[PDB]
Design a protein around this nucleic acid. Structure first.
Ligand SMILES: [Zn+2]
Ligand SMILES: [Zn+2]
Ligand SMILES: [Zn+2]
Length: 283
DNA sequence: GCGTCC
DNA sequence: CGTCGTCGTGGACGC
DNA sequence: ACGACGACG
């Protein structure tokens, strides 16, 4: 089985994310549990928690089908002591909110060295940031997303993801999410079935499918190897529809949230219907 | 400085 | 009753 | 982008 959805808006309350996901016939969803551009939010209450849990129950969304994401502000490998501590406190709060909402996964980007520290030192800071959050919370897996590798951002090579995992004590609560736009912008080709196969064969050797906890299904406005993070609607960008058909027909992507972060929410329901249809169409 | 990032 | 214009919030990054 | 708020007339 495959679970397919989009990163829906949580405007007006978290329960609305489950309602919006049901409106596009999604079998999975992603959301921010608090505002993506702010350091802190009001603590979750019994009401908000119950309303969210009741809507997920009503629309058949178990924790295995939901992939929350953290804010844009957090930098888990920050080279500055004070900014690293602030990012770690916010990340702990993000994980605690997940635990309270009955969620079991949390998607986040590794972090950036800001040209101040080496890539090894940055990756080690990231692994320790994960260790601190896993030591403070329970039942939530830290899902590291790969990146396009803009600026000083890390996570653009599968080796970066494997190096962070190696530094994580509790391997049962660390995982990865592969974003197709990010992989393509980073130089992992997906334009042909042969390319997709090669990209995922390298992923299996370097990281391993035992850690894959989710996917982000995005076409790319940016070009191959551009190191530019610019998504596009499926079939409208530089990757094309073929890679998405290929993913849908490959059983290694079963049982995990497959999330659209495409730029045109007006067509999310068509993207979901097309993705579902690929499981019973020709290769 | 604005838009994207998700 | 709504919905425009605008601001606060505040982080890196492409362009 | 989300929530908030003044001003509509
Ligand atoms: Zn993504
Ligand atoms: Zn992206
Ligand atoms: Zn299958």
């Amino acid at each position: 089985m495959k679970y397919i959805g989009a990163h829906v808006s949580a405007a007006g309350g978290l329960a609305n994310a489950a309602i919006r996901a049901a409106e596009i016939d999604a079998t999975a969803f992603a959301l921010f549990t608090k505002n993506q551009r702010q350091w802190r939010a009001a603590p979750l209450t019994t009401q908000t928690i119950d309303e969210f849990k009741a809507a997920c129950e009503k629309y058949h969304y178990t924790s295995a089908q939901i992939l929350p994401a953290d804010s844009y502000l957090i930098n888990l490998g920050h080279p500055v002591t004070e900014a690293l501590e602030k990012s770690r406190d916010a990340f702990i709060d993000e994980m605690q909110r997940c635990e309270q909402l009955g969620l079991s996964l949390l998607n986040f980007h590794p972090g950036s060295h800001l040209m101040q520290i080496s890539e090894e030192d940055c990756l080690a800071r990231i692994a320790e940031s994960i260790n601190i959050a896993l030591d403070k919370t329970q039942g939530v897996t830290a899902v590291i997303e790969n990146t396009a590798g803009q600026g000083s951002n890390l996570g653009f090579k599968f080796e970066h993801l494997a190096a962070i995992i190696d530094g994580v004590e509790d391997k049962s609560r660390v995982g990865v999410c592969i974003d197709t736009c990010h992989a393509f912008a980073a130089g992992y080709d997906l334009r042909t079935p042969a390319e997709c196969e090669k990209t995922f064969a390298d992923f299996a050797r370097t990281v391993g499918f035992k850690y894959l906890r989710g996917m982000h299904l995005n076409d790319a406005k940016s070009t191959f190897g551009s190191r530019v993070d610019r998504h596009h609607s499926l079939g409208e960008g530089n990757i094309g529809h073929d890679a998405f058909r290929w993913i849908m027909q490959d059983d290694r992507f079963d049982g995990i949230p497959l999330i659209l972060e495409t730029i045109n929410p007006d067509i999310w329901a068509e993207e979901i219907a097309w993705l579902k249809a690929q499981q019973t169409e020709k290769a």
